[PDB]
Amino acid sequence: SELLVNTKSGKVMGTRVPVLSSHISAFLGIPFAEPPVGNMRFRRPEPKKPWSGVWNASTYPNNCQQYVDEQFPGFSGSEMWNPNREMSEDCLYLNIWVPSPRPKSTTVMVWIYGGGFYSGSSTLDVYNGKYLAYTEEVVLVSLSYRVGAFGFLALHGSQEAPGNVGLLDQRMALQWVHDNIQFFGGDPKTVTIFGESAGGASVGMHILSPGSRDLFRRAILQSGSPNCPWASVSVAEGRRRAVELGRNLNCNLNSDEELIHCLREKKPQELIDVEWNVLPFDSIFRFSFVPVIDGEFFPTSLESMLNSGNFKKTQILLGVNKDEGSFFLLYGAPGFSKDSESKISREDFMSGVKLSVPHANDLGLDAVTLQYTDWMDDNNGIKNRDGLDDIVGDHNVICPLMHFVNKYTKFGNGTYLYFFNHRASNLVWPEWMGVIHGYEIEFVFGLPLVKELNYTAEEEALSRRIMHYWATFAKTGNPNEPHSQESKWPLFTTKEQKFIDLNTEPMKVHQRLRVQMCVFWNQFLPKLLNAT
Amino acid sequence: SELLVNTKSGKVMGTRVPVLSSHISAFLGIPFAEPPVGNMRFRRPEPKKPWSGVWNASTYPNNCQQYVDEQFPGFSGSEMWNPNREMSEDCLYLNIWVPSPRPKSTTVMVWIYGGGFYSGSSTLDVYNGKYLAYTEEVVLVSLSYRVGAFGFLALHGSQEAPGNVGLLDQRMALQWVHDNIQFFGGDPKTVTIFGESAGGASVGMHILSPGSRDLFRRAILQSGSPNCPWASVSVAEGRRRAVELGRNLNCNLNSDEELIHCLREKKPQELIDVEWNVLPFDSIFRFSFVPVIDGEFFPTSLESMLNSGNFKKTQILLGVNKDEGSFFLLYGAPGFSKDSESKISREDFMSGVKLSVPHANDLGLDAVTLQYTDWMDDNNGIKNRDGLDDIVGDHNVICPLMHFVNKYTKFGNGTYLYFFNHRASNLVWPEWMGVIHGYEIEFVFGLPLVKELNYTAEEEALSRRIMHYWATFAKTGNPNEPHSQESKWPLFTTKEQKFIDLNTEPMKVHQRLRVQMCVFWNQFLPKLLNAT
Ligand SMILES: OCCOCCOCCOCCOCCOCCOCCS
Ligand SMILES: OCCOCCOCCOCCOCCOCCOCCS
Ligand SMILES: *[C@@H]1O[C@H](CO)[C@@H](O)[C@H](O)[C@H]1NC(C)=O
Ligand SMILES: *[C@@H]1O[C@H](CO)[C@@H](O)[C@H](O)[C@H]1NC(C)=O
Ligand SMILES: *[C@@H]1O[C@H](CO)[C@@H](O)[C@H](O)[C@H]1NC(C)=O
Ligand SMILES: *[C@@H]1O[C@H](CO)[C@@H](O)[C@H](O)[C@H]1NC(C)=O
């Protein structure tokens, strides 16, 4: 049967699923690791012990234990990101969508979800891989990984809670794809890993980590890069936060053994209830448990790795959205609300900048304020709101990504950069938030192709173009069709730094994406903060 | 006779001079101080001993000893500023232009020449006061004062070379006008002092200095303010430079007595030949001997005086030109030349910034560079040239003046701000220099009214408007005519900060003159330099 596949781990039984008036195969909830429960919590993943019989892969698996956003109960805008399956520590599974009839050896795309390393699920509706698998005829895989303390509590030195285990979960899933995707008709030598936000940072981290490089061919990064200020911490900070977590749960802090043992007896929700209390500053776009520069997964600092060319060299396709920062200001900066235009006063603006650049002293805060203020109209509420929006987006996503792309392009074999600036017609979030963090995903996964979702004809056309760019890049390392008549997405070169916009209007080529502000965030500010 | 005037110092005989097909009286070379020669060099001025007989005031007096610009021999552009009379230490004289018939008690305007405190003459053609005296019917006076070491060598503590004597020369001339202008038909209670560049800084210094305040009614400042970075030094720096001067002339440096005695035996030209060797940095727009914050002429720092409102409160009219910096880049920054478009490379740009902000560390230099560079086109020669031009102008003239006007307006009784941006049609300097430092003067003194000079009809109209603004302000404290139909020059208020352009086009009102860049130079940079 087309729904029965024999893998090196055992036999699996999928299910036929409808898609755009047709059908394809789906293998949901395939385990790739042993459940990381009990004494296994915080530990490196362990390969799934082979099973006899047939594994039923007809239903989605549980989502990993995580913080659940309840800011807007019932609002689809925020709940579309919450886990849609019961949560459990037994959550290391992957999902595969296979074209029908089953291909013999086609392009593979593995999706890595985002969520600030503190949340995320592979089962979200916006991540349904059938549309992309069916439309572009690629084998689409979505993996999962532990988030929060469960996946990133770091007590460097101990082997019971080494840190980065969530990244190792991802790697093991990639190892499984490498070893078994051939049986599903996928070609293991043509695997493209792609992800958004923390998922994009993750993709970049696998590009850097020597132990991950060999497991994939090409990479796509959406609104995220490994060097983002929120994507990693030092082993000292990681240790400080883990101890602080134990302190919040009345744990014995005499030794890592005592601390770890205590954290292991706690129920998942107990750790999650105090997760945000360990942050060192009053901030936004900062998460408690994230990857640590351990000297193992990451041999040295990310910066020195980027400078020496210590990373996988291949082709990459990456980009950002126009208003990456709005989500984080809505949720944590004073003055921003979901149902108002959120015109920001001067006082709230400054409160926002301190929150956005929590690691800066007063001189640094002034530098930022000066850089983003129109002194010819400093009391303009719209201008203060948008300026703060740009500050958060430039500092946390865009500039870190531009630094990465410029460093990578020096050693890489091909780079394609995009700027997503189309605001969906059916967007439920307020207008002031613009092209929101995470809203290019629905186009990448082809949601606009399903009429019931209410997108326009141009948006469906845009989704098809993007899906074809992504899939074509995955297949050849170039988003453009061989000898096509369509407009060409120019290669991003170290000299010309070209990129394109991604919207319903005719393609436009630009250069030096937000170079003015990124010279500030990547060159000046760090130099200023260090000199003081 | 109309050309004979009996003053408290003695009788004076003037001369009738033609002007625009008419005539007026001129009293040139009237002494107001004892010659500051021999043992008097460096000393505070002494009032001129009254004379018997009639002083012949029919010819211009000698110019004070000063550095003479020889960069462009024969070029009218630069030679129009060099002394046009023999130089001599015996140079403390003033000139008076009186309407004919002699007025009974009319408005008086006293001109204070600029020249970086190291040069200047009251006898320059561009300072001829007959056009203004005749056209607006005001008594126009032009004073003189010692420049260079002769007027500003400062050895705080000694009474032989206290410093600021050049400023005291100006005051004594103002004292003479106060006491004698009535005999020339001038009203001593309606005296307006005006000056350009160092002359403008001087006007602002008399506004601050308690000992000068009572000697005038109103003030006009052109391209200069007391707080300019080049307009003053501390007593320690003043002392260091004086000793360094002595060191350049093989003087005994054991004591102020030894040093001063040695400097007094030197010929004027010997001091001038090494004058520029005492500067502490490799710079531009920095002069060796300038006013010192002595705690006498200036009771405390200029900043604290401005903050506490420690200054004369009256009306003021001041402004700047569009390209104040070009002159100084032409003369001292690599890459700029008189006969080329001076497109500046990236290397020369950076050389220029270091030269323009000589007191800044590397972080400060980066801050400036970042602030004035278009990173979307950083190799644009035109953009680098103009950016450097703006850096020099903003740092040395505009921003310091904006800081002054905003501080003054808080306590003042009326402020009128202008932005002169008209490039004369007969300008001999290259196009890239734009509206040059010092070129609004010819319009203030009405040179465009004389056809032989080759200005256009609109330029003559512009000159007449400006002269009438200046004279009307001098007479009433408001540049606008009572119940006139002409466009109104709005008052500059602390809240709206309005100002007007000064050119041949219809009047336009603007707000917050170069506020974006001045927040950088007046608030951020100083804070950055101090924190490091
Ligand atoms: O529980 C007590 C502590 O709570 C305080 C802090 O919690 C606030 C967390 O806010 C995080 C930011 O929220 C943004 C929501 O992002 C969801 C959409 O992201 C799309 C990309 S996967
Ligand atoms: O003599 C040896 C030392 O010389 C080196 C330094 O001398 C250079 C002096 O340059 C000063 C700047 O020149 C600008 C000329 O300005 C004249 C016009 O000013 C108009 C306003 S009054
Ligand atoms: C495994 O097979 C059962 C039996 O048909 C079916 O319900 C489904 O495909 C899998 N299990 C569940 C609970 O759905
Ligand atoms: C990629 O690598 C191939 C072979 O190594 C080379 O021929 C090609 O020019 C490279 N392309 C880019 C964009 O570097
Ligand atoms: C003083 O009077 C003389 C005599 O007429 C005349 O030359 C001039 O007015 C004054 N002196 C000089 C040298 O010009
Ligand atoms: C100037 O002072 C007078 C009287 O002191 C006052 O009436 C007038 O309002 C003042 N004008 C300004 C602009 O301050």
From Swiss-Prot, chains A, B:
* Hydrolase recorded as keyword: yes
- Would you say which domain of life the source belongs to? Eukaryota
In the record, biological process GO terms are: acetylcholine catabolic process in synaptic cleft; choline metabolic process
Alphabetical list of Pfam families matching this protein: COesterase (PF00135)
Keyword Cell wall biogenesis/degradation found = no
Summary of the tissues where the protein is detected: Found in the synapses and to a lower extent in extrajunctional areas of muscle and nerve, and on erythrocyte membranes.
Q: Which residues are glycosylated?
A: N56, N413, N454, N530
- Free-text activity regulation comment from the record: Inhibited by substrate concentrations above 0.5 mM.
Q: Which InterPro entries match?
A: AB_hydrolase_fold, AChE-related_enzymes, Acylcholinesterase_fish/snake, CarbesteraseB, Carboxylesterase_B_AS, Carboxylesterase_B_CS, Cholinesterase
Catalyzed reactions:
acetylcholine + H2O = choline + acetate + H(+)
**Top EC group:** hydrolase
Cite a single GO MF annotation: acetylcholinesterase activity
Residues annotated as catalytic: S197 (acyl-ester intermediate), E324 (charge relay system), H437 (charge relay system)
Q: Which cysteines in this chain are paired by disulphide bridges?
A: C64-C91, C251-C262, C399-C518
User: What SUPFAM superfamilies does this protein's entry cite?
Assistant: alpha/beta-Hydrolases
Query: Which Enzyme Commission number(s) are on file for it?
Result: 3.1.1.7
Mind telling me how this protein is modified after translation? An interchain disulfide bond is present in what becomes position 593 of the T isoform.
Q: Which UniProt keywords apply?
A: Cell membrane, Disulfide bond, Glycoprotein, GPI-anchor, Hydrolase, Lipoprotein, Membrane, Neurotransmitter degradation, Serine esterase, Signal, Synapse
Q: Name one GO cellular component term.
A: extracellular space
Q: Which family does it belong to?
A: Belongs to the type-B carboxylesterase/lipase family.
Q: Please give the subunit comment from the record.
A: Isoform H form is a homodimer; the asymmetric form is a disulfide-bonded oligomer composed of a collagenic subunit (Q) and a variable number of T catalytic subunits.
Please describe what this protein does: Terminates signal transduction at the neuromuscular junction by rapid hydrolysis of the acetylcholine released into the synaptic cleft. May be involved in cell-cell interactions.
- Under what name is this protein listed? Acetylcholinesterase
Say which species the protein is native to.
Tetronarce californica
Which gene name belongs to this protein? Answer: ache
